[PDB]
Design a protein around this ligand. Structure first.
Ligand SMILES: CCCCC/C=C\C/C=C\C/C=C\C/C=C\CCCC(=O)O[C@H](COC(=O)CCCCCCCCCCCCCCCC)COP(=O)(O)O[C@H]1[C@H](O)[C@@H](O)[C@H](OP(=O)(O)O)[C@@H](O)[C@H]1O
Length: 398
């Protein structure tokens, strides 16, 4: 049916979607699926030199807190997969400058504190969503950006990465490659402790299967037999964990059949800013819920039209659209003059270097030296969160 778009050569985001496939939900809302389970997102921050063994229920004989926290982070990463990768309508392609904010109050857990979700569409050509999720009370901070490049056989490339900070401890996370939805290739979790987790996805075997191995260092990752732990199963189901070679003492690691302890708190439409997602797409979302294809086309075209004419006003003024909470930094070796450049002790560079991960705009998970890494004129612009920009915020509230 719609497959008649296969003849097109290039990024599908250049095309336009027929109303009958549209979801009333914008892609900027999918940012929440990085911390959908508040307790798992915060767990690592509760593990310390004095309680790691009692917190590592999967292995009360864990060697160190660094390792106990890696296990919690691994469990957390697994939990984000289902809600993110589990007819089905296509989410709306966000407009440039589109915001989505919310918060998990965690009322039944005063020790959790408030966790804030900030999400912004920092690019429309091509579509790129930046995001941040932070819990000041426990010093857990997450930031990253996402980009989906669909091309035509239907290919789907994943770009970007996510960085998690548990106090003074850092974790680099790279999204998994995929295909129409099943995951493939590898995801990486590189900690500032030297610890590395390599998640290998496979389909066909059972659906949504994966193997996750934890290594003491990136040198050990070369040989799977060196793995300290081995986790296996379905990320949409259950998975087992084996320490070293103790195949006899296999354990349940994570059970994806999990109920969210809390839903994301979003303020009512009346209080929302014209830039906030649900407020801006209000009419379209309504038409979609209604089933009126012509109303969907009308309301949507008028939003895209306003956006288009808005760009024309900027182009004819020499000025451009100012991103709100995220700034684009240049990680290339020959930065353009006047470009934003990374700090001295930049976390990304440090962790990427340990993983030997490419810092270019190659598909997520690309290692230094791969075919994609050595591609001509490849840039290295990465969106970064600026906590100050949110602190200085005057209009948007939670
Ligand atoms: C972290 C989140 C989870 C990861 C993502 C999950 C799955 C990804 C896997 C496969 C998805 C790939 C392909 C899906 C298969 C077929 C549909 C793609 C064909 C397609 O309509 O062209 C694209 C969307 O296309 C993607 O932007 C590429 C697709 C990106 C969207 C990803 C979600 C897709 C979910 C699968 C739903 C399949 C539904 C199809 C099956 C129906 C039963 C059209 O956008 P739209 O009309 O909404 O958006 C328009 C903009 O609003 C306008 O401003 C723009 O005007 P401009 O300003 O003048 O340029 C205009 O050109 C449009 O961009």
């Amino acid at each position: 049916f719609l497959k008649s778009i296969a003849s097109f050569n290039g990024d599908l985001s250049s095309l336009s979607a027929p109303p009958f496939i549209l979801s009333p939900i914008s892609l900027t809302e999918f940012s929440q699926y990085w911390a959908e389970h508040p307790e798992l997102f915060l767990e690592p921050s509760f593990i310390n030199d004095d309680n790691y063994k009692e917190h590592c229920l999967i292995d009360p004989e864990v060697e160190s807190p660094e390792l106990a926290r890696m296990l919690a982070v691994t469990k957390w990463f697994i939990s984000t997969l289902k809600s993110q990768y589990c007819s089905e309508k296509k989410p709306l392609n966000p407009f440039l400058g589109e915001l989505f904010v919310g918060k998990w109050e965690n009322k039944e857990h005063p020790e959790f504190g408030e966790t804030v979700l900030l999400s912004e569409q920092v690019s429309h050509h091509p579509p790129v969503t930046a995001f941040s999720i932070f819990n000041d009370k426990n010093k857990v901070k997450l930031q990253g950006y996402n980009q989906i490049k669909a091309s035509f056989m239907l290919t789907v490339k994943q770009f970007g990465h996510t960085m998690l900070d548990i106090k003074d401890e850092s974790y680099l996370v790279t999204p998994p490659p995929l295909h129409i939805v099943e995951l493939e290739g590898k995801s990486y979790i590189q900690s500032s402790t030297g610890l590395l987790c390599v998640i290998e996805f496979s389909g066909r075997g059972k659906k949504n299967s994966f193997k996750a191995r934890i290594y003491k260092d990136s040198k050990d990752s070369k040989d799977k037999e060196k793995a300290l732990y081995t986790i296996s199963g379905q990320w949409s189901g259950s998975s087992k964990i084996i320490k070293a070679n103790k195949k006899e003492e296999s354990r349940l690691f994570y059970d994806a059949a999990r109920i969210p302890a809390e839903h994301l708190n979003v303020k009512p439409l009346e209080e929302q800013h014209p830039l906030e997602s649900r407020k801006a797409w209000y009419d379209v979302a309504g038409a979609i819920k209604l089933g009126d294809f012509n109303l969907i086309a009308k309301t949507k075209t008028e939003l895209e039209e306003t956006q288009r004419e808005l760009r024309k006003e900027e182009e004819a003024k020499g000025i451009s659209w100012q991103r709100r909470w995220f700034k684009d930094f240049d990680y290339s070796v020959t930065p353009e003059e006047g470009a934003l450049v990374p700090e001295k002790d930049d976390t990304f560079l440090k962790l990427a270097s340990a993983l030997n991960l490419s810092t270019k705009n190659a598909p997520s998970g690309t290692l230094v030296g791969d075919k994609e890494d050595r591609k001509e004129d490849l840039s290295s612009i990465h969106w970064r969160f600026q906590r100050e920009l949110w602190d200085e915020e005057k209009e948007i509230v939670l």
